Each structure stands twice: as structure tokens, then as C-alpha cells.
Amino acid sequence: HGYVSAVENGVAEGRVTLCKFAANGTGEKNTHCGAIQYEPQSVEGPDGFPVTGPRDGKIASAESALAAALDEQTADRWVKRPIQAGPQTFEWTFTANHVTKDWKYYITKPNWNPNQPLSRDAFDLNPFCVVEGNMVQPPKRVSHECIVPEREGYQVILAVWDVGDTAASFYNVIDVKFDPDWNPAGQIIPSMDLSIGDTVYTRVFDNDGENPAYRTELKIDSETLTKANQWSYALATKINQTQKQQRAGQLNGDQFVPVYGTNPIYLKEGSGLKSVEIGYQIEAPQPEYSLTVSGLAKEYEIGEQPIQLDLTLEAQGEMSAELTVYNHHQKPLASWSQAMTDGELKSITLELSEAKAGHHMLVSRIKDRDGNLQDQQTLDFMLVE
Amino acid sequence: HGYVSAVENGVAEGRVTLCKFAANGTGEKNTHCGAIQYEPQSVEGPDGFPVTGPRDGKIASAESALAAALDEQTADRWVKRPIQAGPQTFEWTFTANHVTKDWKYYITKPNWNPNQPLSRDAFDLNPFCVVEGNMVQPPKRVSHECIVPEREGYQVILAVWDVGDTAASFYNVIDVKFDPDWNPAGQIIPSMDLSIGDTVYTRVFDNDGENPAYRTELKIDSETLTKANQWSYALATKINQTQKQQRAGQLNGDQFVPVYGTNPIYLKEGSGLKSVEIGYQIEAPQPEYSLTVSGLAKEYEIGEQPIQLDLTLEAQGEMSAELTVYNHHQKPLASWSQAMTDGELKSITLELSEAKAGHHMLVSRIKDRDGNLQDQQTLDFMLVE
């Protein structure tokens, strides 16, 4: 288990790595990577690439269910790390120890299409770098000296770690860009949808702090602008249309090009401008959410049987409800969660994993359809002899 | 804009900080923080705490919409960072320059309840540490020498950064646990739901590598076990139930207590065991999703009016669809996304923001009900004068 990293001498972090760790130097992360963001070390799949191995369109994820998001492929989806042709050092960090057959590195063909899913077709299937593992366990960090072929613009390098004792390999794709008076100073991340009537805007900082003369404002006045990727694109575009000392969008050649996704923000050298943050104004209404819990007694008497909470839940709003029972020692004795529709009544019974006299509590959490906590309520009850 | 960090001499990172950055030493992250994970610098709310400011239950989020997930409060929800009473150093990192009135630090009362929403009553409202800002802008990173009061177990520290020239403050709560032959070895992280028929299991490593004899496996054989927090609890519980050299759960006193959430894994010093990773065996092959796109022509002539794509879309499986048009230079010219039900037919029209002769692509991405990418397909088309 492990991943391509850059803590020692590595030229560039793996795609999956940047889901968990910030890029060296720039601080960027990849976004919306799904579950693999919590275990970048586990992009493991069937060995035998390219003859067998992960199938086309499932190379970046290695067919792992946790890493499905990595298989998306467009020109603007992923953070790209600077690189040059010739001698370069690639670095792996291992969280677990495996006997190793070898490591192989592949690179996209010059004619690869950055908007098609990665495939054998997209790569030169003759690896540009191979390092022998000698069927022994490697140390916890390794550095590989490779010769990176000549390329221009955006390319993808596929690092494959072939393990010796199992029918498995680890696959880490790497997004690189082959190598002025514009300084990065923040970015527009599309991380939350908006509602009509809302407004998203920049907060621009000069030498004296925030300065409203430099703000750019986008009113959310159409259903299309409610989508995060859409208002992001639009705010980035409006910055370019209306400002002299600010630009936004991904760097494509010498141009700043707003995309439907993340849009970095840049400030003009000599402008005196320091950075930009984003602010959100929501004139919007607060849907009301509510989960009425009924059926909890004041006391439960310990009998020959396991203690049971027979409860009724009434939902106001569309939600996910999560209930947990804790004894007084912070030990969880029962838990339950389910989606509930606006106006739904449900009858449930929670069985306590154990019954000792004392103060207990039921914690009920309400999350909206988009998954954020709207409310938490904690109800006290007692077990008695 | 800024957050409580541990890049230099800070004792413990802010809760929000750990949504983006891995913890010092352990590499632990807070999970499912929502949008604020992409901007930990932005937990800004009304000033005047505790007399005014964010209301009870919205202290951790500072009433910010990005940060609502932070208001959840249970004994096991958040990563707890070790601390001791007495002299300690707290650290802030700033992304943006604000004139500062002061920094204040509060700690929970010894009788606080870790399972109730954070409130003024949970805190000693006499701050244990105050540092004057003198109404000037601070350096991009500051270190504050404080004296932490005597406490045991889990406590919350609220750090408040009061900004001088606006009616706002930044609020960063910090989860701390006040201070033998059980070594930290890995983590069961509830990042994904499973299916009946699946199995989740441990992969235990000793000096010879993966050792199959030490494996613990859990069959998902009930509706209940499909939920991530549920199988996490169950696997940790089964480890404790069947292994002599391994423990799983959050440390509560001297005991390892499995929780419905993240369960750390420990190995007995001198057992020969080094670490533990998690593996997943998934049985159901399905489903297949498809979005068939009809009406894309080979060529389109420019053009007195903007060029328009008359498409018919057909959905297989419940999904959300995303379409994007890219020109040859990979500037996005149009974007669309919406949910579709299994078998739905939708006809739409996409208008290109510009019409120049050359090779174009229409990219579609299918996400399943859970948000997991299921397919990507791209069609080539050409614009001509």
C-alpha cells in the first residue's frame, strides 16, 4: 500500500495523493475525489497491465470501488504539476510492506485526448522507466531516477507498482504540465450550490486590507446560475470582463480561461493587491427542518431482556436522520440512520448493546438532502434497577 | 481569513483545519466536513462573543453556510488531538490580511457534555488566554503562548480572532484530549456504504508482509451492515472479539471502544505485527448506467445566429448527467447538468458561447444516485464556415 508523493525528492504528486495532501509549493488539492481521499494508499487493482489489468476507462481507479471519481477525464478536471523532459525523480511513500516485482512508468502519446477516458490507446505502452524490485520488500520510501520523454502541454504519467506475492498492482496516475507578471492569489472553488436571489463575490485585499473598490459581484438570477460549476465559471468570466489588475480561470497557453469547475485567481504584479477570498450573500430563505422524536421514557427498568427504545420520528423537510445512544461513559450502545421524506413518520426500535443503571442520552442529528447538519438534539434518559 | 494550525510550534490544529490538512504525526483527517473542507480559512461570523456572536449550536460553524457540518457534537465524531495542562503554544496561519483587535481562547467547563451542541454554558466564559492585536495587521503566521487549565479527557478549546475594522470574528474550535504498549497501526474509516453479499476485512502486516492468519473479516449480511458507520463499528467489534494481539476503537480511559464512525486500530507491542490496512470484497457486478445522446451532427455551419446543439438524451439507471462542450483549444463553450430517472427521455438544446471553425467535443459524465461516477463518453463534431 502506498502512493506517489513529493516529500523528499519527488517531482510531482499522484492525482490521488493530492486528494489528501496539498501540492508542494502551490498548496492546491484535487477536489471531489470521493472515498479514496481518505486512503490514497489503496489504489490497488488486478496485475498484468496492459495485457490484462484494469480495463479501459478504469485505469486511474484501478477498478477500485472507492476510487471511481478518479476515472473522470477532461482538460480542466485535475490539478496539473509542472515537469520537464529528461532526468526526473519519482517518489513513492509506502504505508504497508509488500514484496515487489517492479515499478513501471508510462506516459500519454502526444496525440492523446485529454477529454476521453484514459485507455491503453492513450498511452505509449512501452514504459519510459522500469525499476526492478527483485522480489524483495522495499524500504518505506523509494526514489526512482527516470528519463521523461519530450512532450508539450498537459500529459498523464501512469506509475505502476507490481507486487510479487499477490495477483495485484498499485496504479497512480499523475497529471503534469510540460514547462509571470501574474501571481496566484486565491481561487473560486465550486463547493456549494446557490439559490436564486443569492450573490457570490470576491473580497480583494491590498496593502491596507480588504478594498471594496476592487470587488466583483455576481447576482444569482437564473436557475442555471444555481449550479456551483456554473456560478464559478460566471464569476471568473466577470472578473476578466471588468477588472484590470485581476484575472481568473485556468492557464491555457498565455490565456486565463474560465472553466465550469475550479477557477484560480491571479493578481497583477505591481498592483499592490495581495489576495482574494470569496464571500457568499444569501438573501435566501432558511427552509425549516425538524425531527420530532416521541416514545422515549424517563426511565427504563433493567429486566431479563435487552433494553429496547420504541420511538417515533416525524420529519419536517427532506433529510437524513442519524440517532445514537450513549451511556454515561461515552460508550455508544446503539445507532440508526435512514433517509426520510418531507412529512414522513417512522416507527423504529433501538436495542441497547448493554444494560447498566445510569444516565443515558439519545443524540438525534438532522442532515439536509445535500448532507449538511441542520440540527442536533440530545434527549436524556435513565436505566434503573 | 485564517485558521488554527500546527505547521510550526502549534500544539493542536483547529477542527476545520483537519478537514483539509492531515494532522501532525498521525496523518488523521476529519471526515465529511462539507464545503468548508476546501476553505478552512473562512469560518467567519458575527463579532461580540460571548455576549453576542454566533448563537448556541452554531458556534463551531460561526453560522457560516459552508461550515454547518462542524456543529455536530458527540464524544466520537471528531479527531481528538493530545494536549497537557500548563504552558502551550497556539498557532494561526492567515490567508488574508485583517487589522486585528485581539485573539481570545476559551476552554470547556469540566462538567461539559460532549454529546450536546456547543453552547455558552459548555464554556468557561473567562478566557484562559488573551493576546492583544493592537489594531494592526499581523504577520502571515503567529504564535501565542498560553497557559492551559487543568482538565482530563476530551475538551473543546474555542479560539476567537477578532477583526478590528469590521463587525466580524473568526471562530475555530479545537478538539483536544488531555494525557502504553498498544501501538497505533491503522484506521477503519467509514467512507463508503456496502452491499448485502459484500465483505470488509483487515489485512494485517508483520515483518514478512501480509499475514493471512491474522485477518478479521465481516460479511455484510444485513440491511443494517450496509451503512458505513455500521460496518465500521461491527468490524472493530469483531476484531476485539476474535484477536489477542489487536484492538480497535477510540481510546476511552484504558479501554478501546468501537464507535459508529472512525475506529483506530492498535497492535500489541512485541507481537511482531507492524500495521493494518482495510480491504473490500464486492460481490454484485451491477449496475450498468448509460446515457445515449441523439442528434449530434457530424458538422455544423457557421452561422448568423449562435450555433445550437439539438440533443435527445436517454437515461439508463437513476443518475445525474453532466454535459460539456470543448473546442479544440479546450475552452468550455457550454455546460449542462441535471438529474434523470431510470429510462427517462430528455431533449435539450445547448448553445455554444462562440462559433469558430474546427474540431469540437461533447463530453458526458454519468453519476449514480450516490454521486459515484459510472461512465464517461465523448463524441467528436466539427464546425465549418
Residue numbers in the entry:
A (entry chain A), B (entry chain B): 24 to 202, 209 to 414
Sentences from the study reporting this entry:
Colonization of these different niches involves an N-acetylglucosamine binding protein (GbpA) that has been reported to mediate bacterial attachment to both marine chitin and mammalian intestinal mucin through an unknown molecular mechanism. Recent studies have suggested that Vibrio cholerae secretes a protein that mediates adhesion in aquatic environments, e.g. to plankton, as well as adhesion to human intestinal cells. This protein, GlcNAc binding protein A (GbpA) binds to N-acetylglucosamine (GlcNAc)- containing carbohydrates, such as chitin, and is secreted by the type 2 secretion system. We report structural studies that reveal that GbpA possesses an unusual, elongated, four-domain structure, with domains 1 and 4 showing structural homology to chitin binding domains. These results explain how GbpA provides structural/functional modular interactions between V. cholerae, intestinal epithelium and chitinous exoskeletons.
Although extensive efforts were made to crystallise full-length GbpA, GbpAD1–3 was the longest construct that could be crystallised. Domain 1 (GbpAD1) comprises a four-stranded and a three-stranded β-sheet forming a β-sandwich. Between β-strands 1 and 3, a 65-residue loop forms a pseudo-domain, which consists of short α-helices, a β-strand, and loops. There are also two disulphide bonds formed: one in the loop/helical region (Cys-42 and Cys-56) and one linking β-strands 4 and 5 (Cys-152 and Cys-169). Structural similarity searches with DALI revealed only distant structural similarities between domain 2 of GbpA and the β-domain of the flagellin protein p5 (Z = 4.0, RMSD = 2.9 Å for 68 Cα atoms). A more significant structural match was observed for domain 3 of GbpA. This domain has an immunoglobulin fold with significant structural similarity to over 200 structures in the PDB. The crystal structure of GbpAD1–3 lacks the C-terminal domain 4, comprising residues 415–485.
